[PDB]
Amino acid sequence: HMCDAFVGTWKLVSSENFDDYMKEVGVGFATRKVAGMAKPNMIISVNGDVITIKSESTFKNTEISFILGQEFDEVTADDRKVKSTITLDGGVLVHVQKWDGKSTTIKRKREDDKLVVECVMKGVTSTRVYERA
Ligand SMILES: Nc1ncc2c(n1)N=C(c1ccccc1)c1ccccc1C2
């Protein structure tokens, strides 16, 4: 019943500072431009201990399935090959991606009727707000 409040289909409604976040991650110009235009959905489901997060957009369709606390391989939408671990901390899903001696953290939290996604790469934070589809 862990992540019940996350389950569902969500649509992007606002973004702030995402180009700067992508620059800090190392995303190149053309991918920043096209991927920054995208308006993904996020489809979150749970089956037993396995959480699945799918993100569909005109740019790319991605999907991850995982167990909390258990590292996995992920290919990001910008084609990074990262080692990811996702945990639940005080009701927030905390997703750490490691690659090339670098690290970024993505937090997903329910706030009112929204699902708020905060992405942090060193000093740079981007906030993306999703609402139910
Ligand atoms: N489908 C789809 N399309 C576009 C994007 C995207 N997913 N996902 C994100 C993203 C964002 C925050 C946390 C996790 C993922 C992503 C990652 C890097 C570069 C571009 C995008 C945009």
Question: Does residue 3 come out as left (phi exceeding 0), alpha (psi in the -120 to 50 range) or beta?
Answer: alpha
Q: Which residues does a 6 A CB cutoff place in the pocket of ligand 1?
A: 22, 27, 35, 38, 40, 55-57, 59-62, 76-78, 106, 117, 119
DSSP 59: S
Residue in the block written with tokens 């649509």 = 11
Q: Could you give the CA distance from residue 72 to residue 133 in angstroms, rounded to a whole number?
A: 28
Rg (CA), the chain: 14
Does residue 116 sit in helix, strand or coil? strand
Are 22 and 35 in contact by the 8 Å Cβ rule? The answer is: yes
88: CB partners within 8 A, 6+ apart: 2, 3, 68, 94
Are 110 and 5 in contact by the 8 Å Cβ rule? The answer is: yes
Name the residue of 59, 80, 102, 120 whose CB sits within 8 Å of the most ligand 1 atoms, as the mutation to test its pocket. 59
Q: Could you give the CA distance from residue 49 to residue 131 in angstroms, rounded to a whole number?
A: 25
85: CB partners within 8 A, 6+ apart: 69, 70, 71, 72, 95, 96
CATH superfamily of domain region 4-132: Calycin beta-barrel core domain (2.40.128.20)
Q: Could you give the CA distance from residue 12 to residue 38 in angstroms, rounded to a whole number?
A: 9
Residue 108 among known ligand-binding residues? no
Q: What is the resolution of this structure in A?
A: 1.1
Name the token pair of 107. 């937090």
Name the token pair of 29. 């110009």
DSSP 80: -
Residue 130 among known ligand-binding residues? yes
Instruction: Please give the biggest Cα pair distance in the chain.
Output: 41
Name the token pair of 133. 């589809």
Name the residue of 76, 95, 126 whose CB sits within 8 Å of the most ligand 1 atoms, as the mutation to test its pocket. 76
